[PDB]
């Protein structure tokens, strides 16, 4: 089982930059995804392949990394970008992270 | 040894290993192949299905 | 217009069986592999099961293996999850997800399209 | 007000031909596929024959194929089962049943409406 | 032939709950029905589609299961519910079970 | 009483068209796929054409594809073979054959029932 | 005698919808998967969409996926392309093409048969 | 084309046993049939599925095998068993053999 | 409910062929490699043949190589063993077994699920 | 995406031999087709499988190659052979070449 | 061929401990399994990986060893544990031991 | 019953390309590495190319490296050899050979099974 | 027709990650080892990392040990280099190089084939 | 390049003993094979590993030697054993010998 | 680290002979290589093994030396031979020289 870890909570004022990190217990070769979930709503895919944005995902969401260290960066965090962000690997099985909550500062 | 030859030996055994995992990989592409044959099989059953809806 | 709509949730007593359905539209349902993902109340997301585009290969989580069965019928574009021997730990919102792999990606992709989710309550 | 009234039963010695009927009222007989169901004395239920709504396709059980013929007359709403070369194993209660399938189910349904049943006795 | 098996009999007093089981040799995808037959009368459809009740069926009858294993549940067993219950598939052919008898305890 | 009766044979000169018929009785003709099989004088048996039970899919041998057309009309239980631009190689006995597959065999079956056979002679 | 005839072209302003048709004859339409191929004025050929012989699986180009839908009616031997959200980049001749794979080729084949082509002009 | 081949001719006296064979150019998975034809008459099916007899066929006819090699066995040759025997496959297309004739010895 | 059911045993005289079958249920049959194991009367167990999860690779014992063929049909969840040129030493109980390897074990595992067994007797 | 490349233009007088080239960016295992398109008309298949001629195609058209390099050879060039010739792969997707125009010298 | 040894027969009264042994001609890297077979029944997996118990196996069964020497230990031998135990390797091929019969003392 | 059959030989002029095929039967093709062997008229045997069981590693002779390409299709049990820029020195009989090494030999083996061989003539 | 193509370059600020790729064609990629060679603007060539043909052994320079990760995928004939803890001193042109040693050299060889080279810029 | 050399020809009367020879330029550690080729026919393996007979090879064919010097011996030469005999090594690359023809004396 | 040193620059007119040199800090037994890199282009291998020309190298390129001192001699210098030349050893590790520039005189 590949364990995926994330920071617990992140406080960012609107317009700033948010750097979310993801760490994998083993190596996932660019097989990592990022999701956004608002309370009461389904998860929404943001990044796949650790760097590729989804269809209608704005350019302010950017991901990078490979192997065991991955980062999700949001530049100029908007009002609609305050949500829980999840990290998932799909190399060995389908395991998720516990999520990082972005709250207004 | 770092400077040892990294090239494949031509005379290494080319035959499959019997005691290799015969089970399937969960993380293999489950989506369809676009370039599979799209035409009908001539030997598919030409007879009617009894359980098809009999109502108009 | 790519949509997944779940149904069949509700309250069920422990040890009983419950069946979920997922209706797809806006894409060719028969060319994609489908997943089930589970989110317990106040917890993170958990993968449940996967089915091939034709229904041949099926894979399950260790927590649901033997009890749950994933199936599909491409005729009406429906995905099914038969949940048996339900426990209190099975209480969650169950999401229907599509496999977001390119057709030549060789490994399988992320969960591209998610459903709205259906809540399953296992209690007395 | 939906009924299926069967008739034509009785006692006939082995090898002869006996013709059953099924009078249907309270619904549109011309748009439904009609079945025949059998129950031996002290035994379970057995399916016998099926016919399409218009009389085109007919399906029979392996124990009655060739010997039995199912026919219908949609004008006056009568279903028929013509049995020939009757045997002692054909002694049972024959039920006339309507197909309980939605008009867009594509896979047939359960036996919605059953007839009262008619005893057919094959003895010397 | 898809063989269908049911338990022989069960003894339940009025007011209790009766759980009937039905197993198929192969997969029957929600194409199962339950019938109630009293001696000297025609069978009566209770459940079709393995979960849907018929027109004049009380809410005390409920079915569940798909594939091979199916279950019929009767809550608050009444005096009219003591009869033989048949399990039928209609996926490959129209084959029945041997029946399960509900007898007053 | 499962019978197939071919008709429409005779002598025809090369380049002209002929139509064969096959009347079926004793079974539900509308639920079976039907074949045409060919046997040249002094030669073996050759498969010609296949039509689905509903007339949807039609398949032909390479030697007859483009020239021959197989069709059916389930109303009067008759199978047809339209042979145009006939050649001397087409002179043979044409057998009407039934597909002897189980309704759930998924792979088609052998030719269970054959007709009487009819002669088609192509010469000047 | 194997021919494909496209229809339904014309002038449409951007953002609207247009439906193409393709009538087939001279071959068994129900047994073939069919394509749509595009050629802009002065440009090269571009593949658009594919549908299975029965309509189960559909595949689309990246430049038309979502906007375009491919369908068929095997009863009338007609192929359809539903073009929506039309853009100036969609102005071209649209060709209806048959997949020329042997029935056991396992990989699909070249575009065996082409239509005459129908012109779609997207402008104001 | 899956080529199907049978032995040319064998002479058998009545009451003996005949062992016919049929080899397929490619693999036909138990999709083989045997037919009996007499002069001036249509062919008649004997064995289908490479092992299953037809409806009104006596037990003296028997076949076995799968894949590429198939055999037909006729025990206690009768006066009615003097006819041409054809081998057919129905896995890829419907191709016959050239037919094996049995002759009075 | 993970089960393996063997069938097709019996008595066969030396030199002939016999086919074994193994039907699986309660798990995804298409994702597992399958084995055949043999136990002569009064002796220990002997491994016979292995087939990959898709049927790509087959491996056989030295005693049965060339005579026995292993094959599977993932659509019907069934496994086969075609034994030709049967000899007296092939008289045994033939067990159908599942490769008990984790999907990422890289080496193949023990025999997790065994069938009930089928007896094959080779004698005159 | 398997991109297909062909020479732009090619000038040959009638009766001579023309050799057209085609290169695949990835491996196309004899899954290549050649088409002939005259102005104002639909394309016409010439070669499939990289070497097999179509039904009504004269023997003066021939193709060869596999993998990533393919050629179309025309012997005894006629007046009907002056048109644009396209190269298409059908292994990964259905992508065409940009065409080579044959013009009278 | 990696040929596997085992002791022939050991006699233990119920309630005591039983120590089974297994030796290999060559090295098997924890690729050893243990099976239990009762007369007239199919073998049942107990231990795989030379130390790991199967799903529904009581904790009284314990295996140990790696390479050449392996041991199977049963603590508090019960009435159901009197049967033949087989030792199998799956490193080079699938070869079994000759079995050890545990009999009531 | 182990067989190798070569095909695709004939006459080709120097400087052109031609493809050889080798169909295998009677053994598990995907588990073996395959060779090509060359014998010029009046000369000895010469080794051409080697391919692994999975197609991963390909080794070529110094005489053909760069010009010849070896490939396989394990699904169809067929081996391939593409020979481009053919020279007059390439006229020979081409044999298809199997690597007869034990699966745990670690060093590769001899050519246990040979095909019938095919002639390629490189001349004008 | 031997080519090596590097891709995945660009400009990335110090401290972040970037990934490199190397595509191989015209030769058997799985048979040779691979190297990365670095050339700073205005400086000489610097060897980065070596990986075996099958990926068993990886070696790195002292300056990039730990930070950089080299990997290959023999199935896609691709070589990957992952750049972690990027600094401004890593701004250079990166080359993909093949160990062009003979298969029986036992000492390694020079870099026979060089790629076009990709530009990597590390600045704010 | 490992050059393998064999004698040009041997004339042996039927029933006698033939002793072929093969010398390698370098050492081939029991990685030698022997083949028998008749005119117009493909070669047929006799010995592998320099001493091990193939499957259907009569006991009259025998091989020996290791390193650089090897010898194939035929005892009681038959009528079917008159053909060209090749020596191959498969240790460094796959190089054949020039062959030795045995002829009726 | 095996340091390698090369001359800084030398000016030679076309048609003359250019002699380059390379010195290693330690011993490298015929495991030295030479590359030709023009500005804006990837290095092109010329000599490997300190004496052997590569595949597509004209005969005017030649190298020699063993152990510590190595040389690269270009005879009849052409307009195509004006570039930087790098010296590499591969005995212990993979180190490069600072390069020698040949400039038009």
Author numbering:
A (entry chain L), E (entry chain R), H (entry chain P), J (entry chain N), K (entry chain F), N (entry chain D), ...: 2 to 94, 96 to 107
B (entry chain I): 1 to 56
C (entry chain H), D (entry chain Q), F (entry chain O), G (entry chain M), I (entry chain E), L (entry chain C), ...: 1 to 52, 52A, 53 to 82, 82A, 82B, 82C, 83 to 100, 100A, ...
Q: What do the paper's sentences say?
A:
Many malaria vaccine candidates, like RTS,S, are based on P. falciparum circumsporozoite protein (PfCSP), which is the primary surface antigen of P. falciparum sporozoites, the stage of malaria parasites infectious to humans. The structure of PfCSP comprises three domains: (1) a flexible N-terminus, which contains a heparin sulfate binding site for hepatocyte attachment; (2) a central repeat region composed of 25 to 40 major (NANP) repeats, which are interspersed by a few, N-terminal minor repeats (NVDP, NPDP); and (3) a small, structured C-terminal domain. Cryo-electron microscopy (cryo-EM) reveals a remarkable spectrum of helical antibody-PfCSP structures stabilized by homotypic interactions between tightly packed fragments antigen binding (Fabs), many of which correlate with somatic hypermutation. In each complex, CSP displays some form of helical structure that is stabilized by homotypic interfaces between tightly packed Fabs bound along the length of the NPNA repeats.
Each of the extended helices in complexes with 337, 334, 311, 356, and 239 are right-handed, while the partial, disc-like helices of 364 and 227 display left-handed curvature. For example, based on our cryo-EM structures, a full helical turn encompasses a minimum of 10 and maximum of 12 NPNA repeats, as observed in 337-rsCSP and 239-rsCSP, respectively. As previously shown for 311, the tight helical packing in the complexes of mAbs 334, 337, and 356 creates a secondary homotypic interface between Fabs separated by about one helical turn (3 or 4 NPNA2 epitopes). Protection for these mAbs generally ranges from around 85–92%. mAb 239 is slightly less potent than 317, at 81% inhibition, while 337 and 227 have the lowest levels of protection in the panel, at 68 and 52% inhibition, respectively (p < 0.001; Mann–Whitney U test).
